[PDB]
Amino acid sequence: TSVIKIAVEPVNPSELPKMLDGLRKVNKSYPSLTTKVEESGEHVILGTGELYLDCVMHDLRKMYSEIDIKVADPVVTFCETVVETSSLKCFAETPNKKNKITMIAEPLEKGLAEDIENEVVQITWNRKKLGEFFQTKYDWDLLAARSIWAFGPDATGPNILVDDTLPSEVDKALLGSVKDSIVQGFQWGTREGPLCDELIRNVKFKILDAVVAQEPLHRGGGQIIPTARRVVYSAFLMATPRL
Amino acid sequence: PFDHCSLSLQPFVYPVCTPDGIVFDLLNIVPWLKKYGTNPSNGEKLDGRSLIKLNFSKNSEGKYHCPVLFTVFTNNTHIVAVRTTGNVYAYEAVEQLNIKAKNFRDLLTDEPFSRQDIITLQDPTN
Amino acid sequence: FEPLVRDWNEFNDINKIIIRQPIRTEYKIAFPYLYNNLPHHVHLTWYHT
């Protein structure tokens, strides 16, 4: 995993397109090189180690682009996590106050999160095999396993989205309807992070109370996502973010 | 910056977005047209009725935050607003809730919009 | 030796820097393309023989 982070910028701001052609060329030559553009004006390079970045900038400055470039000093990329279970519900009802989502969060135990990263328990399983794995491996509850909704940031991410609100959980109609954008907002909040805007790691989210607009029309459809995101961030923050 | 007028270049009391892209507070821009039918953004003379409003939320501290994502606005943030709406959101939320979907409506209300009605008033990448 | 040859910047903003360990001349020489702006006529040392 490339964790070392290096920001790059030309000396004469006139020279930005040539630099961008350079960054393309180096992306073509290097298999794991990651490049990004940070909103705050930075073209950022992600690599694995000092020698790796040295030879990247060698190929950049000498052969692909003979433009003159300043280079910021390296840093690492961080993750964000929690140590503890959320203490109260912060809960978002969409702009038109039609759907309310209460959801709280907690830290995952290493074993699972590393298993999810290892793809041991890939969610392309059916719920049966998921529950088998889970109840067996981590003293997991079985209704919990049936409640295991998603894994978040992308196809495999250390985070885990699980809903537990039984009697109204038997509103599986509008639930089963909106769960898609619910998980879309989950994925967004998890890729985007509250603290540093860095990928969050090793977190469990539990949707505990979902009020849904009857016939959750475009109201629910569009407006629910940012609501779900604020829900994620608010639980996370509310009881105990960490780097 | 975001919250600064252009005829004055100091903090803006009631923002009134020009259809071209320059915000300018009407508490100033009224007299500028009453004495010169041209705007300061371009000495080419222009309409006054074209002035759209702009409605900027505030947080527990009152800072002008975007509506949907609650991100406190800074001097690098890209801020686009819906001319058909009058409310200002972050370019990220406006796009990836109206670019990922096809629903070129409003996000604060259900107001449908024209996909040409988003004006991006401040974006460092330009 | 004598120096071979002899404005504003936005990176250098010190409020943005994370200073853990002070960058020394050994580092700037070991990795002359990563710790160095304007490297001209720089030979690349490395060996692990």
Binding site: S40, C196, D197, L243 | V72 | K16, I17
Partner: peptide, 19 residues
């Protein structure tokens, strides 16, 4: 010193990009 590298890193990263 040790107790506050997290405060320092988050502040610096936000002043760098996130504001």
């Amino acid at each position: 010193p040790a107790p506050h590298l997290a405060r320092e890193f988050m502040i610096k990263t936000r002043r760098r990009k996130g504001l």
